[PDB]
RNA sequence: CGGGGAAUCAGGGUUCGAUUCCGGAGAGGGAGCCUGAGAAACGGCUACCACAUCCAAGGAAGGCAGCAGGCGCGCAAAUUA
RNA sequence: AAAGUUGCUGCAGUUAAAAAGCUCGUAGUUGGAUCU
RNA sequence: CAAGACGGACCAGAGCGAAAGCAUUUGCCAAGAAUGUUUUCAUUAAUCAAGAACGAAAGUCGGAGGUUCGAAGACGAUCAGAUACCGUCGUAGUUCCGACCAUAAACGAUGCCGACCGGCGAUGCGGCGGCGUUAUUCCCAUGACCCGCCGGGCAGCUUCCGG
RNA sequence: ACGGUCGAACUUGACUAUCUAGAGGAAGUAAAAGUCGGGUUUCCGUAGGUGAACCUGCGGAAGGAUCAUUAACGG
């Protein structure tokens, strides 16, 4: 929640806002870790394909 | 500084062998991984069956086409590429021909203008490329 | 900390001999240092020295003559057999004409020539030329 | 000294390495039979033993005479 | 160079070459021994006895006059303490620092200096067990530390 | 397979030693035996496991990491005198 | 073998590859004179 | 009036700490180097695999608090193509307490202990020896300066010691 | 023939490891000229912004080009 806090908010509201931000950050970190592992796996298999291109299926006849 | 005691022999030999493992030649010789990744399997020459003829482009500052031959080895089944050395010697190689193949000389390293080729053809159909090139022998088929 | 006081003595006299000084103060003093200095003195490499006597480990003041090029100690004190002494004097000495591997045998602290003469082997201490 | 009528001694020695011209400290453990006439034997005292026929699977020597430790009375 | 500090101090005593008793000192060996005995009955460490003898009675070195050092005189008579001087002092220092640490939990500097103190205590304990001054089964404990002092 | 040893090398060292001498191990794989002073033997026996020969279809006979030789294997190695 | 590019003899660790963020600490290694 | 924050100028190549680090006043608590000793012990030591404490900032859990700042984010300007710069607001955080992580250009890009090899005078601490000025001329010691010396440090300058 | 011992091997599940056929999935390569189209001193460690780079917040470095002034302070 992108809501600016005022001076009048007390407990059970500020605490709920803070834990909502914490849960959002936790899900965001899980998503970023998934993106990093997916990119690493795809780069590894594309490097394997480039190496297979280097070894064979490269020439004229 | 080095430990220069009288009872420090086992420390010195343990350190020497652990730092021996950090050499490139020693690790390539002794780890047993480059021996298993070597297509020849630590042999001087191998014998294969010709699959295809390839025109490999030369590395950039020299512009030419090298006539190589893609073969499949008999004893392990690996596919390798061997450069046919002289001019007009490619016409002696045919598909599904038995070839004796040796390396270039840099022991597993790509040599000179040809990228990704470790090997060169020595004999074609149980006669040498040199005798065919010089017209000393005829090849059967 | 301080170990092998003969190394300290030889390093001090070598540093002062290279600097062109006439006298060296070395501390502490031990008997093996005195025997080494006596061996060098009998071949005329250093000259007269005084043992200043404290009730502690003493001190030595040696007089210098410019006849010494390098004085050196070998650590650790390896076991030198009589057959292996030729390799040692090939490694350390600058020539077959001069230089001295000081070594201690059961007959005493002596040179390599005296060890050859008396047919005894010992532990290596130094060299000087 | 924890078996029934048998003890474990150790032999320390120096092993020479010729490439480095140096030594390394090695030890070997020996299970030796101790006769009941040698009582009040403490841990860490010198013993001289003599070779005999095999008495068990590992016991081969026999305690001949024991000299006490250096520090103790 | 100190063993737990990076300082390299040079401050120490320097005896003269003369081991002989000075002429002005009109004290015999038995009188010096009796003074040591009465200081021990008063209750002092041997270093404090030596300081009192040097400052007040003019006895420079007791082993130059009597021929024997203070702790050997106390041990031969039988008034030496059970645990030695420096070990007792280090254990008392450890007890004081530990009491401060149970007062103040967040004192990291006190914890580090306590670790250094116990390292010194263990070193002295090993040395005294090697020389058969302490029994081999003697052990310092954090819980059993204040009771020994 | 381990030594004697071999190649290289100022000195130190590094690498190799399947191979005619010595010792060990095994006769396709394990196992159990008979005889004999000596064998857990295989150019001795009894099995199971894996290959395999003669068949008249019931049965019998197997063991070349011995000397020649053959196949296969491989870059790689001799005469059925 | 050259390779003092495995350094025991006999290498290196400011800037070229490199010293642990820091201290304690068991095993290991080394350990001051001094006795004809 | 209140709220949390921060301890400027003095603040220096000055000091302390194993390092990260440490700057309002006072009191308490337990430590520490150095110096001085004609004190005591008498080798008790050095470096240290295993192991153990501390460890900037940022970050994560449970509590409190939110002054400033502020990543993200929201707008506003600016353009053949701008989606970084700039301005306003502002979330986590920045603060404190108790648990976690053990990472920095965590730098002297220079292991620790010990010895020797040129010189100089500034500074911090301690000690020693002193003519003098000062506490409105101080009646004695004591503090501040001034002149040398010694020990341990933070540093500097100079040198064809040699590398 | 009973029993015992040595015991090859056989059968059943688990852990594996190897040899060897495979419908399909995702790719790449050769053959299609086929269709439409300006900013930044150099960095380090963490966190965010779409993974990385990059930018920013915080804390660190120089591996970043020191000009000018500075003897009185007593009445």
From Swiss-Prot, chain A:
It is found in: Cytoplasm. Residues 1-34 are annotated as: Disordered. Expressed in the epidermis. This is Protein LTV1 homolog. It is linked to Inflammatory poikiloderma with hair abnormalities and acral keratoses: An autosomal recessive disorder characterized by mottled hyper- and hypopigmentation of the skin, sparse scalp hair and eyelashes, sparse or absent eyebrows, and palmoplantar keratoses. Residues 5-61 form a coiled coil. Belongs to the LTV1 family.
From Swiss-Prot, chain B:
Hydroxylation at Pro-61 affects translation termination efficiency. Signal peptide: none annotated. It is found in: Cytoplasm, Cytosol; Cytoplasm; Rough endoplasmic reticulum; Nucleus, Nucleolus. Changing residue 66 to K: In BTDD; decreases hydroxylation of the protein; decreases the accuracy of translation; decreases levels of incorporation of the mutant protein into ribosomes and polysomes; patient cells become highly sensitive to oxidative stress. Residues 1-19 have a biased composition (Basic residues). Residues 1-25 are annotated as: Disordered. This is Small ribosomal subunit protein uS12. It comes from Homo sapiens. The lineage of its organism: Eukaryota, Metazoa, Chordata, Craniata, Vertebrata.
From Swiss-Prot, chain D:
Signal peptide: none annotated. Citrullinated by PADI4. It comes from the Eukaryota. It is found in: Cytoplasm; Nucleus, Nucleolus. The modification Phosphoserine is found at residue 31. Component of the small ribosomal subunit. The ribosome is a large ribonucleoprotein complex responsible for the synthesis of proteins in the cell. Part of the small subunit (SSU) processome, first precursor of the small eukaryotic ribosomal subunit. During the assembly of the SSU processome in the nucleolus, many ribosome biogenesis factors, an RNA chaperone and ribosomal proteins associate with the nascent pre-rRNA and work in concert to generate RNA folding, modifications, rearrangements and cleavage as well as targeted degradation of pre-ribosomal RNA by the RNA exosome. Belongs to the universal ribosomal protein uS17 family. Component of the small ribosomal subunit. Part of the small subunit (SSU) processome, composed of more than 70 proteins and the RNA chaperone small nucleolar RNA (snoRNA) U3. This is Small ribosomal subunit protein uS17. It comes from Homo sapiens.
UniProtKB/Swiss-Prot annotation, chain E:
SMART domains: Ribosomal_S13_N, Ribosomal_S15. GO terms for biological process: cytoplasmic translation; negative regulation of RNA splicing; ribosomal small subunit biogenesis; translation. The modification N6-succinyllysine is found at residues 26, 33. The keyword Phosphoprotein applies. Pfam families: Ribosomal_S13_N (PF08069), Ribosomal_S15 (PF00312). Gene3D superfamilies: 4.10.860.130, S15/NS1, RNA-binding (1.10.287.10). The modification Phosphoserine is found at residue 29. There is a cross-link at residue 42 (Glycyl lysine isopeptide (Lys-Gly) (interchain with G-Cter in SUMO2)). The modification Phosphotyrosine is found at residue 37. It comes from the Eukaryota. GO terms for cellular component: cytoplasm; cytosol; cytosolic ribosome; cytosolic small ribosomal subunit; extracellular exosome; focal adhesion; membrane; nucleolus. Ubiquitinated at Lys-26 by RNF14 and RNF25 in response to ribosome collisions (ribosome stalling). It is found in: Cytoplasm; Nucleus, Nucleolus. Keywords: Acetylation, Cytoplasm, Isopeptide bond, Nucleus, Phosphoprotein, Ribonucleoprotein, Ribosomal protein, Ubl conjugation. GO terms for molecular function: mRNA 5'-UTR binding; mRNA binding; RNA binding; small ribosomal subunit rRNA binding; structural constituent of ribosome. The keyword Ribonucleoprotein applies. The modification N6-acetyllysine is found at residue 26. There is a cross-link at residue 26 (Glycyl lysine isopeptide (Lys-Gly) (interchain with G-Cter in ubiquitin)). HAMAP family: Ribosomal_uS15_A. Belongs to the universal ribosomal protein uS15 family. Component of the small ribosomal subunit. Part of the small subunit (SSU) processome, composed of more than 70 proteins and the RNA chaperone small nucleolar RNA (snoRNA) U3. This is Small ribosomal subunit protein uS15. It comes from Homo sapiens. The gene is RPS13.
